[PDB]
Design a protein around this ligand. Sequence first.
Ligand SMILES: O=c1[nH]cnc2c1ncn2[C@@H]1O[C@H](COP(=O)(O)O)[C@@H](O)[C@H]1O
Ligand SMILES: O=c1[nH]cnc2c1ncn2[C@@H]1O[C@H](COP(=O)(O)O)[C@@H](O)[C@H]1O
Lengths: 812, 810
Amino acid sequence: QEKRKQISVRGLAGVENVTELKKNFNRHLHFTLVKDRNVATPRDYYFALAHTVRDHLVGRWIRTQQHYYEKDPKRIYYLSLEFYMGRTLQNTMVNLALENACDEATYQLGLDMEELEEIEEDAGLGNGGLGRLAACFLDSMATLGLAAYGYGIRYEFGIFNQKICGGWQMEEADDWLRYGNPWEKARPEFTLPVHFYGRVEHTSQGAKWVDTQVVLAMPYDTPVPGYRNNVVNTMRLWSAKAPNDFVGGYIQAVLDRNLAENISRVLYPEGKELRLKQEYFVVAATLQDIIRRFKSSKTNFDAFPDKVAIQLNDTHPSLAIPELMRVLVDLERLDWDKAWEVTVKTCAYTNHTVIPEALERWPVHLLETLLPRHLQIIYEINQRFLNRVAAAFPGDVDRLRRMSLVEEGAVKRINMAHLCIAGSHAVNGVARIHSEILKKTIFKDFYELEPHKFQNKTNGITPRRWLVLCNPGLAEIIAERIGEEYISDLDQLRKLLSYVDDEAFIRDVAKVKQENKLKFAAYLEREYKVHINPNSLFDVQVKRIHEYKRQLLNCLHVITLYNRIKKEPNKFVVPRTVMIGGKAAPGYHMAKMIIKLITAIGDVVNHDPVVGDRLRVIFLENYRVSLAEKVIPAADLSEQISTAGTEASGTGNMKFMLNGALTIGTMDGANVEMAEEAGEENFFIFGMRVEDVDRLDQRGYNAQEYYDRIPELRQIIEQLSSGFFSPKQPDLFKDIVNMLMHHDRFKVFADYEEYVKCQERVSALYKNPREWTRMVIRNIATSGKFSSDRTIAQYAREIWGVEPSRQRLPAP
Amino acid sequence: QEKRKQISVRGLAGVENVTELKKNFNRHLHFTLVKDRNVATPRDYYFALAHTVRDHLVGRWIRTQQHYYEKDPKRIYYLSLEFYMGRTLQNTMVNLALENACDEATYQLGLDMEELEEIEEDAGLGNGGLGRLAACFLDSMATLGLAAYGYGIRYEFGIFNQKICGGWQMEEADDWLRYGNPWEKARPEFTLPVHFYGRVEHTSQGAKWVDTQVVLAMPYDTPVPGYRNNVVNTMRLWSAKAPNDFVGGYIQAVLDRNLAENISRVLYPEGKELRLKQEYFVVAATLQDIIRRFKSTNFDAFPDKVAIQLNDTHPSLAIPELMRVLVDLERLDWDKAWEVTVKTCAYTNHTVIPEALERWPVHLLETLLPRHLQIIYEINQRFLNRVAAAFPGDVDRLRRMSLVEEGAVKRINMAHLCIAGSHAVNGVARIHSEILKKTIFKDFYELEPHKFQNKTNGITPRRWLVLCNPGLAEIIAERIGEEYISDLDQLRKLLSYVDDEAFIRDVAKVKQENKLKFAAYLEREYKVHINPNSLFDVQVKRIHEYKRQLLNCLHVITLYNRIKKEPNKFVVPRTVMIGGKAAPGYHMAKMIIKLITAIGDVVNHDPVVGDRLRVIFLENYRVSLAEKVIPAADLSEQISTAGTEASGTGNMKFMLNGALTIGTMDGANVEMAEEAGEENFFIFGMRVEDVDRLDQRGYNAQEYYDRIPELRQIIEQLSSGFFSPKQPDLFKDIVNMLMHHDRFKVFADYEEYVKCQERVSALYKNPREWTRMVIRNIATSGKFSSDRTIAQYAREIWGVEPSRQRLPAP
Ligand SMILES: O=c1[nH]cnc2c1ncn2[C@@H]1O[C@H](COP(=O)(O)O)[C@@H](O)[C@H]1O
Ligand SMILES: O=c1[nH]cnc2c1ncn2[C@@H]1O[C@H](COP(=O)(O)O)[C@@H](O)[C@H]1O
């Protein structure tokens, strides 16, 4: 029927227009929300505005998906158990260029588009740099016009909210879906069975997996927009539902429903059965969807590697390998050799870890119980892989056992990293030194078997959310020199390097900072009721709380600096606000104490009359994406102080650099590459290198020798032990001292001298505003390498086999 | 801020603009559904249209609510456990006059609206008459401008879909919410706690109900549109949610999470805890909403600004819960709160047999609602005090009127609660209301005679004429205009056309048209030929012994035997249709359904019968099927043993739709035969006082079995396994019941029933007389408009005046 051709998007999102936006706001507030102004809450005004914006997203979304079906490109699937999405309202507006029109519309309607913006929940789909990487990636993948899908789990309660009560962290539930989410769209039409347990029957033609428990995976779609290019991609999130049954004897299987349901309930965290059901759930539903989409296109799986690419972000979705094999062999009735070829060619794997302890391993008895068919396939893959290894290195019997997917001991275990390696055509580290240690130590055996398989894709950040969005002031003055262009091409921030000796640009760069400090200082009062000197150097360390992250080294310096303000109260010291934020893992007893320690240091220093405002110590509560975007552009100094070799890359690093902060750090992670781009001279690189980490384990790290040679280190330890910082509980901080002094596995005391000295240099350079800003410029100018546009282009050409494309799609 | 005035509903569509409906249909498929014509399903297209119609509904909804806060009128709250809504799309199009525009709109978009209409699920919200009544009343209350709210529970899996496999009823889950309900609106922001268990603590200022388990009640709003008057009222349904808190152990909070959500999962149809939980849940959540709206203050103005209708005793806890909120929370005193309670609340009784009234053991109340018990005990004592006053020394009367009944187990009689806490107790038909005064509640009557009222049931002529029978609505409006739709009594004007040939042939024509559409639907599923010229003989009732489809079966089989015996005899062909659901756990009902299909297998495949007889069991009888078969019927079977039916709302549907009624003197039949004239009715069988006489000298089914050879042959056929050749014994427990323990006297009404059916067949042989009789039934229908019923609620109970006035929407 040719009449149906009037069922079109043809003129529905007519004009990005201030009058139309007001019309839709009303339309959405009244018809969609079923509210009016008499009962509308700020939250209801936010939903209305969100819906108004979503219409523009979805129109562009329809065309893009229509475009992909017309042009049939190689499709790329990004599998992650984490999508650290943050807020979408503002990000959608910059990328669609609706920023000014909306503000104009809401103002005219009598509302503040800022009030509204702050009602939006941080999406509870993520926890760390792992999920934030995936978020930057999706945004970059869309900007470079790639046919790309983010697949994950729709979590309901995310990772807890952090409240600090009397210095102690408490974990509140993050019910960020209590009032729903305007951005996502339910697809009950597309609900899919996921199997668990049962057993394997090896009859005739092949294996049948029978007598299984079914869980239903129901997808929710969220559009992810490119930068001003009209391409809107899909993030598809899976939600678990128990099947609705009415043989009639007993309901005790209430258990089932509940145990099915909480696959989607919470993020994690060692290895419960639940964590494994999450991994399989996401993998099994995702693969059905990919194969479904491969089939509709105008069965031959020779073209499969040519139309599908699947990225495993870490080992979490590793079961994709045996699952893809399972469908191809058991269901589509291919044979092992052919399916294997298709699998290896389809899958690639990204590792994010430096230490062989942290890699994922599951007991075989677990796998045998929940995924009996998958254990078998994993063994078969082990047999044939270890066959290649035996052919390539005859005789070397030790090699077979080291490289095996099966790990022998008390507790037979499957090593999931060895699986991903055997079944991926490409494997990559996440920063150059990291990818090198992968080749050199952690996976040397696999690298020697297949050198070509091992790559590097240094991580990156999106300049949308991490420059234009959160620091418009900086984006605005860069534009004036070189245009609106760098936003999609960060490389050409290099042209700023000709403006280093330009006077007006220096005050300009320094003026933006002051204002970002002003805004953030005011934000601290309006919410947590706590004083801040806006002239002071902003010393910020925002990372997960962990021993190797070394916020304790930071603390050591703070108390050091504090002490010297008491030994020499009249000496001019460069005034500083030291700010530390980050979430501690529940159960992690040491990180809990470290937070308590920080706030106690704050409790002494912020109320000492001799200090005044020359030094201040704040813990930043409930660190997350939206806070990141508030505190980052307000930073002068970026604390990247992990023990060399313990960081794979880092990503906050690059955010601070893009935003006019200078870095104090170790020669570690992506700092190596950041210093390589800005020049050693423009970074504050201090302390032991990786070579001296190994050197010290070799001769044995004694921490007592430092305690003698440095009287300041002796003094702070005495203050800690006698209870200077915990007067009502003197021995509160004992197992912090104990660790630092006897079982400090991350050598805090070692780097302390060369740290506090490097810090003094910083203060001295901050005392000189002009010279300080010139170096900041020299940092910002050379921050281009660290865009996620660069990272994804390398992924597209070197791993996926597809060309990036900045061409704007037509419509709407 | 004057800027904020720009936040308004003045710019939506406008309105009967096919143009804008097309544009808005497109919006919704693409932007609301995030689909397109590449990928879209007929179901998708139904949601696109549903949403389009919805935009216009909620506009008027916003206005009707706004207007209710300006005018601050008395508000009426209808509390029902069931709400048999059916389908929403077409009802909304006709009530808003959007039908023609949407029809044309979808048509120019390459789509067919009927096809789309068939996609919608019946709301899984109700079971039988009780539930359809609430739904009809909601339509009426909106049409008569009343400020009404329907309050109930949002059942997730309704009450099962019926499937017939191998002639047996099977019950599948009804997930009618499977793809969502476009008509509803979640309100997570208005979630309320509901308390259960725990214990009562006496302070010195008042009672505290503490240590309770909490269940969250979340409301879903559905708008209900008035007929073309622009008042869109609210149906507010509660969904149960468990709280969250995540420090262990133990996790049997997993069980609380489940028993908490079962509340909302399924309707009934054990003497469950769960059912009581359901009843308090809808009462506690509703009363909070009712009080919030009042305050949004002294409660002296309460009974003048709030009416609470109890539909059956199911929401009877509303009376003690009101007392709880006013004494305990609101801090009134027990006499002031009591006056407010007795004047706020009006009850409605739907039963006829003493042991059908709701009754909860005290041990159970003591466990889950300890405070409510103490309130009941107090109410009972004060109440019994005035019984002893008004009747000195009458100790016998006190232990009859007590709310606390006593036997093996101590029980609270929920009906006696309702009468005591209500100013008006209404029956639902005249002979029913009267027996409430006469035998069932006489004690209560000779104490408060002013209390006891009648409100005969009615049926909305929107759904049940205009919507399901547009052919008959059209021909009626060709003579007398369209004013009757909202004043059914105007159909009396049709008496003037009883001899008019144009009318007589027009009515017969529409009927014949309705049968052809239904035979076509019927020939699809159930693969058998329907002779469209046969008399459509239809019985649609809950499947029960007393309802009596076994009597219908006895006639069906007589007819068969008679054809098989004299094949060359002229016989008026019949399509016999029986439909209804059997309660799970009711074995006799399941067997009756087996009998109906088993008669069907023999008769419908007998070459000797040709197409003179056909027996069909209609699968999964429900509101949207009802509205297909009713217009097609010639003969409505209303044959319950006399005195067992209080009313009978489907009776009125057939009458309005051109069927003639065979049936006993009982329920609504009496008032129907009274309006239409007995001569225009096929009343047969024992009357009420006749049943009583047979009771008094004892009913022996052998002395009916013995006097009648035709009756005998069919029983020997049943017993011998004539209708179940593989399993001769299959119907043994049916024969046994009919012979020895028939508490319902099937055999006794047999002879007279078949005599009367022959009168039906004979009149059917004369098309003109048949149709003229039909006209007399239709023309005389109007009393049974649910607008009539509701106006009598408004004036004589709730004390508001109904208004047919329109309302704007710019
Ligand atoms: O066959 C097609 N032709 C054109 N567009 C399609 C087709 N199938 C899917 N799409 C687009 O892709 C979306 C659904 O994506 P899917 O999950 O891959 O089927 C729809 O909203 C369409 O806009
Ligand atoms: O104070 C008021 N002024 C105007 N409209 C109101 C007011 N209060 C409630 N409403 C309307 O009543 C509707 C339902 O709210 P509810 O009566 O509280 O259940 C809302 O959609 C409002 O439009």
